[PDB]
Design a protein around this ligand. Sequence first.
Ligand SMILES: CC1(C)CC(=O)c2c(nc3nn(-c4ccccc4)c(O)c3c2-c2cccs2)C1
Ligand SMILES: CC1(C)CC(=O)c2c(nc3nn(-c4ccccc4)c(O)c3c2-c2cccs2)C1
Ligand SMILES: O=C(Nc1cccc(NC(=O)c2ccco2)c1)c1ccc2c(c1)OCCO2
Ligand SMILES: [Mg+2]
Ligand SMILES: [Mg+2]
Lengths: 335, 337, 339
Amino acid sequence: SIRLADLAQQLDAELHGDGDIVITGVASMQSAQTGHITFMVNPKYREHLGLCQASAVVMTQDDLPFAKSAALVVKNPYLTYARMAQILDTTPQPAQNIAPSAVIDATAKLGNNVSIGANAVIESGVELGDNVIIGAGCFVGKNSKIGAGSRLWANVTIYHEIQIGQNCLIQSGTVVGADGFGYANDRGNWVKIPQIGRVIIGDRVEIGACTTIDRGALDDTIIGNGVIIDNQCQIAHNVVIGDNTAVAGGVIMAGSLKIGRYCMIGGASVINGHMEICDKVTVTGMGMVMRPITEPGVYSSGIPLQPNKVWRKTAALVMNIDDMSKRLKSLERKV
Amino acid sequence: GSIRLADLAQQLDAELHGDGDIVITGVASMQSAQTGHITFMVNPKYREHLGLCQASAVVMTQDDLPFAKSAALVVKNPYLTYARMAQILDTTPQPAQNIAPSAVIDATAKLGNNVSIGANAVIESGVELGDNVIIGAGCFVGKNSKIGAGSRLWANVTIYHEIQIGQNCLIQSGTVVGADGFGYANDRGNWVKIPQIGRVIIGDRVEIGACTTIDRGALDDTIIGNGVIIDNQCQIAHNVVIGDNTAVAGGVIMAGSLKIGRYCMIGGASVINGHMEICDKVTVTGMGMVMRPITEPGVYSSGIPLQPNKVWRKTAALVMNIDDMSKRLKSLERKVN
Amino acid sequence: GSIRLADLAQQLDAELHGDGDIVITGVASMQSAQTGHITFMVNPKYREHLGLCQASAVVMTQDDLPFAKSAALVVKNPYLTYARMAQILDTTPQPAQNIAPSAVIDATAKLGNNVSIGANAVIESGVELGDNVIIGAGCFVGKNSKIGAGSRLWANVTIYHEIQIGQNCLIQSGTVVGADGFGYANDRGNWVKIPQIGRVIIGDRVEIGACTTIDRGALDDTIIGNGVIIDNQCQIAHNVVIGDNTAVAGGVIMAGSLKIGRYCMIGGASVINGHMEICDKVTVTGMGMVMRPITEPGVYSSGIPLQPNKVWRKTAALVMNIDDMSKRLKSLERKVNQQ
Ligand SMILES: CC1(C)CC(=O)c2c(nc3nn(-c4ccccc4)c(O)c3c2-c2cccs2)C1
Ligand SMILES: CC1(C)CC(=O)c2c(nc3nn(-c4ccccc4)c(O)c3c2-c2cccs2)C1
Ligand SMILES: O=C(Nc1cccc(NC(=O)c2ccco2)c1)c1ccc2c(c1)OCCO2
Ligand SMILES: [Mg+2]
Ligand SMILES: [Mg+2]
């Protein structure tokens, strides 16, 4: 719980109302009750602000005349919402102190205030920095290092020789450092190439659930600082992702892809390997990225949904487009 | 457990034609069935084949009866009867039995009657497990989460905090329920995490496949309706709502704040955009690219299917240059007219 | 781990050019190699660059040899030799060693010789682990499952009941083998679960990536042939059959009752529908949308690639209205045919 005046100060927002209002948490506009603070971004909600029952609403200056409650005025309500949600965060920690059922190799090196959940397994040589939290059931493989403040939720798998920076967050089910898909061929028989590279994850990286990041074949798979990666993503061996790039859910990346900084990869996209995407590129959902992207901007692919009867004709015509092309060329020649 | 054919027929509401004393030990495919097995025929083309079936009994329709070469259970719907008898004779073990000494269970957790918790499972403070709930080995159930009576989790399932799961649900291994949604604000190019303080509410009789992820809501909740079935490797983003009885096949990816109606069927590997709605009774075929809202019931499709590589190369190049093709067509139209 | 260069050359069947007494400690890339490392060159464009590589030895061909600036191992196939020497100098640890006191092993489980079981692994009744099997930490192996000699599971792998795995397999973390297929009947509008009492049969020398799922069959079995390699995030549905030596790249989804032949290559993120067959020696390029059986060997492809969004918008609009284009072209043909 926190006073609205204190909250406005920490948020660097201008208060318009009773600063002694006690705020207990954040809520959506439709769900907000007394004691909740909420926010609005779309001006369509201005007009039924008298139905919102929050104790305070974060809004812009143009929204203030429509306010029917105490208001915190700011330039960017969505960013202010992020900050106040962090102040009022109710999320528990993956673990507290070191659980007696955890299995920790005697040669592990633990910083101060390290928490390890029940039945987590820490291999030899592992280094956990100050304030690191390992959730229940995690595995952290030999000689891996996790920087100060980083947190793993339950049932995360970190392989051997992995480096993770400070203040990272990895959600459950994720696997970091599995073998890359590297094989030689000896007369039709696959010959495993041991993957003795690593994964280097920078600082302030957040990784979703059931995402896989393979280790490099010789050199390393590299995730830059401030990268965010959603659920169900596959990052193949020797991929390099530049700082602050965002990767949405279900993206599949092939090996040796290089992605620049400040990129945004839409969900379910497929990016082929041995190529580079430059800085400040946006790929929209389900993009089929076959070629390098050398200029910033927005890129898209795919033929969107149609009613099935219409699709049947669309797909049949598209598959025979070569004949349409030949017929057009013939007609041009005749005319 | 072995059962007498006459007793099995009564439980199935089938007409017995043959020896009710036959002992049935399990269910098998028609090609694999041996003595002691019961099987079923749904395709009348196999009537001439029944003499090659070694099952002790065969479920079939009244129209099939003259072709039987074994004891027969006559029913209106052999496929449904097969589902029912497979449940009666199910050989699937339970994920756990009793409470394993290696399980770690917070003192404040509330266990109902006949709850089983497998080895090395972890149960946090405030958790409530209803009667007959089974938690598989290596599971994690987060703080204050509630799992309704008769629900079962296979091994290595992760339930985060404040999750509500209904009665008689089944969740396969590797699935994660309640992870943080992909919620971030942008501050001059830096991503600022938005804590996801909503929950997930899963209804009754929901089945979730393996390695599926269902994210918790940002403020309000991610909601899975009653009777929903979800296959493997699906991603259900924060604040998605899925209506009762909807089926989601494997590998479907949904964006945040999507609402899917009741009675829908989403084909495997489909991709659905966020902040929009799909109405009731919509079927999206496999690999559907669902970019816009769907406001009328029916079947919808997308995608250009496979061709020989030599042919695809021309197809792809021509489609990508279709604007030029369009211009040439109009130009020729003007010239002819 | 470390080996004299002469002995390494002998085991690789390589021709040594240089000091056989050099001590090699591991493998490294050309750019990263330092004293004690062996590296390899596959691209002759780097011949001029070999003076900058500080590896102690370089694997190369006879045509590269005049350009060497180090001890050299000459072979016909530098890439295959690199695979073999990386195995010889492999630094990858084992998932486990010995039997961990925190593992929970049913009294009726049967273990061969030199079995290792990692911390907090769970082994159900009736399980059989062959000689030299390694079960990583946190794994679950369900009732009556059998794992053949030399096979290894990394941490947090889930094997359901009645699963059969062959010899010298390798399964990466997070993978689930034997979960229920997606089988349901319809009772007047209510889903009715069909118990999935088939199994999964995995052959010998199969490698499966991370967070891959392989469902069990409804009555008969899901079958993975010998020498198959499967990447991360793959979905193999109930009753799929995959022939020997086929490779499945990451993110591939296979619907139920699909049969794939031998020596196939399925590109990443492909979607393969079920109740159909793909013959031997078929290559499906990435993101392929397979809706019909493939009856002839060769390479098959689908998908419209990326364009700038403003260009894509026009392309998508024209394609979605291609029926109108077709009709206009036919009408124009009639006019040109004087009809
Ligand atoms: C629930 C049910 C008993 C019936 C059903 O509707 C269904 C089932 N299994 C499916 N597998 N795949 C699939 C999986 C992977 C790749 C490609 C396709 C579908 O698309 C499936 C569908 C659907 C078809 C159209 C909409 S949902 C079993
Ligand atoms: C098995 C092998 C040694 C050789 C191989 O053929 C192959 C390999 N790795 C791949 N990654 N991806 C991929 C992954 C993610 C997104 C897009 C593509 C492919 O498509 C891959 C392929 C194939 C190409 C064509 C058919 S399979 C390594
Ligand atoms: O693409 C993001 N999500 C997302 C997830 C899953 C599926 C989709 N489907 C589509 O787009 C889609 C379906 C059909 C056509 O298109 C999108 C996305 C990107 C960047 C972000 C972000 C979300 O939130 C944080 C800010 O950065
Ligand atoms: Mg334990
Ligand atoms: Mg996918």
